[PDB]
Amino acid sequence: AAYKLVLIRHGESAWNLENRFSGWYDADLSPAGHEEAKRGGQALRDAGYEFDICFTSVQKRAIRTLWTVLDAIDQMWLPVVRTWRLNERHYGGLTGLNKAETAAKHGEAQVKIWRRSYDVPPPPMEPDHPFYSNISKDRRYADLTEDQLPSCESLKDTIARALPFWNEEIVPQIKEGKRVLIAAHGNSLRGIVKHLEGLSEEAIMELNLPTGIPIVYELDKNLKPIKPMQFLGDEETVRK
Amino acid sequence: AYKLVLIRHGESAWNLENRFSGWYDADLSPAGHEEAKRGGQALRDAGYEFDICFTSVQKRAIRTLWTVLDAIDQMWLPVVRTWRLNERHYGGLTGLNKAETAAKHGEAQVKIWRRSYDVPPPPMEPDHPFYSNISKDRRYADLTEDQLPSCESLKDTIARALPFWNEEIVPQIKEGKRVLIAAHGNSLRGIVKHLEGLSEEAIMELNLPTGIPIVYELDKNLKPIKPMQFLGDEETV
Numbered sequence: 001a002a003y004k005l006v007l008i009r010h011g012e013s014a015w016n017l018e019n020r021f022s023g024w025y026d027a028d029l030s031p032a033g034h035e036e037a038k039r040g041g042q043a044l045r046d047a048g049y050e051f052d053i054c055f056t057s058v059q060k061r062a063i064r065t066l067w068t069v070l071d072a073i074d075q076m077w078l079p080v081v082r083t084w085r086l087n088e089r090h091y092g093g094l095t096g097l098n099k100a101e102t103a104a105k106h107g108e109a110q111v112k113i114w115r116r117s118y119d120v121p122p123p124p125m126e127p128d129h130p131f132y133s134n135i136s137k138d139r140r141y142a143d144l145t146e147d148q149l150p151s152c153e154s155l156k157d158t159i160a161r162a163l164p165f166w167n168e169e170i171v172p173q174i175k176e177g178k179r180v181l182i183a184a185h186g187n188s189l190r191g192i193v194k195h196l197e198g199l200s201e202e203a204i205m206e207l208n209l210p211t212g213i214p215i216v217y218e219l220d221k222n223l224k225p226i227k228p229m230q231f232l233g234d235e236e237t238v239r240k
Numbered sequence: 241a242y243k244l245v246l247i248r249h250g251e252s253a254w255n256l257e258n259r260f261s262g263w264y265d266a267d268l269s270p271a272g273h274e275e276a277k278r279g280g281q282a283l284r285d286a287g288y289e290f291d292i293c294f295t296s297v298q299k300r301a302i303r304t305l306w307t308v309l310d311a312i313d314q315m316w317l318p319v320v321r322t323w324r325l326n327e328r329h330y331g332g333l334t335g336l337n338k339a340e341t342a343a344k345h346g347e348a349q350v351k352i353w354r355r356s357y358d359v360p361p362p363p364m365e366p367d368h369p370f371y372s373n374i375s376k377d378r379r380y381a382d383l384t385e386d387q388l389p390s391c392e393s394l395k396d397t398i399a400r401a402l403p404f405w406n407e408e409i410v411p412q413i414k415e416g417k418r419v420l421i422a423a424h425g426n427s428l429r430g431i432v433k434h435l436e437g438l439s440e441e442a443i444m445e446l447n448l449p450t451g452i453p454i455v456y457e458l459d460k461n462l463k464p465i466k467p468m469q470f471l472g473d474e475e476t477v
């Protein structure tokens with residue numbers, strides 16, 4: 001095909017171990033999630049992959065995944081672009097709550113509504129939320145307008161602010177012939193995959209991208225995939 | 241008063257900093273990594289905040305920057321890499337230790353090279369073990385034939401670092417962005433010589449310490465208002 005695109009979803013984070021909603025909270029990789037990134041990078045190295053530019057979020061679990069991959073493939077010198085638009089979905093007032101606290105506060109009916117819905121956001125992160133200043137007042141978002149900084153996001157919102165970055169900053173690089181690597185999060189990568197494959201809301205909500213595994217797209221000159229997404233790795237890792 | 245921080249990377253693998261590592265892409269040793277960690281810890285303790293970072297395309301500098309950004313919880317910062325901040329290219333001497341250099345070229349010529357601002361070492365030729373490793377490296381593929389060195393005098397190194405400083409770094413400083421630069425002894429010499437207006441002989445005796453944040457406070461014309469200072473505990477300072 002004319003073009004080749006590689007995605008990688010970061011692995012386990014510190015708060016995954018606590019089954020707490022991270023969202024825009026900047027949780028680091030757990031040691032196991034770091035090892036996952038190292039295995040994904042080794043897969044890219046064994047296949048001889050070369051990139052020309054990298055994109056990631058402003059969250060360290062994705063950035064550290066990217067760093068680990070670049071180290072493994074000896075491409076630490078590549079240009080790297082970070083954007084809040086590739087951030088994980090913003091889970092609003094659920095941020096910092098674990099599974100039990102969420103079910104206790106909201107009930108299983110409401111939690112199922114949020115789980116299955118494309119466009120119903122969770123409650124907003126209010127100024128009295130324990131992570132309100134930690135996230136909403138972080139200087140890394142100082143250049144966002146009022147309408148850009150979310151208090152909460154549905155998946156629709158997340159995809160809606162990821163796709164402008166895809167269209168305006170990544171697509172031109174791909175059509176410039178640059179080999180792109182994107183290291184980001186489940187829901188922002190969902191936005192990209194939905195656009196690439198023309199998936200429905202139903203189909204994108206049942207899509208669970210594997211973590212720490214390079215996801216390879218072969219694209220024609222209009223950035224239409226010519227075959228299903230492929231996973232790189234040894235036989236066992238790919239099967240799972 | 242603008243604040244500018246420089247950091248020079250520490251020790252590289254296989255004693256290569258004592259072997260004219262130059263443009264060979266040597267990684268940090270564990271000790272050089274630990275040095276970078278201590279420097280980042282010093283910056284964290286002092287509460288330093290940056291808005292943009294500049295580094296070379298050499299992994300010992302890049303990894304130093306990464307270690308510092310990790311220690312100060314600023315991994316989200318924009319990072320710009322450029323070959324123009326690379327270490328001096330030591331030509332045919334790259335990879336040789338002191339004794340091997342003296343055996344190959346004689347003590348007289350080595351003293352001349354050591355003391356000279358404008359005399360380059362001999363060029364890296366196709367028989368050098370690093371020749372294709374460096375000159376055909378993909379990261380330099382956009383460089384024109386006149387830009388990719390086979391060797392550099394100190395004058396050459398400073399001459400190709402300063403255009404990046406002027407065109408890319410200075411405008412950031414003048415917008416009020418707090419700049420961090422992680423690079424190498426001789427490219428940082430280029431910056432310091434431009435900042436302080438040093439003579440060739442002065443810059444040639446200046447040996448910046450490794451792994452230590454180097455802090456400049458500049459006036460509105462980017463002139464230092466005071467001497468460079470070092471962050472850290474009292475003994476290391």
Ligand SMILES: O=C(O)c1ccc(-c2ccc(Cl)cc2)cc1NS(=O)(=O)c1ccc(-c2ccccc2)cc1
Pocket residue numbers: 015016017018019020021022091098099102103111114115121122
């Ligand atoms: O049970 C499910 O599989 C499930 C899956 C998705 C969702 C969901 C998605 C979006 C919204 Cl806006 C709300 C809910 C809720 C679920 N049910 S849950 O018992 O409340 C729960 C809640 C947190 C986690 C969790 C959090 C962080 C790290 C690891 C695990 C795991 C489970």
Ligand SMILES: [Cl-]
Pocket residue numbers: 080319
């Ligand atoms: Cl980076």
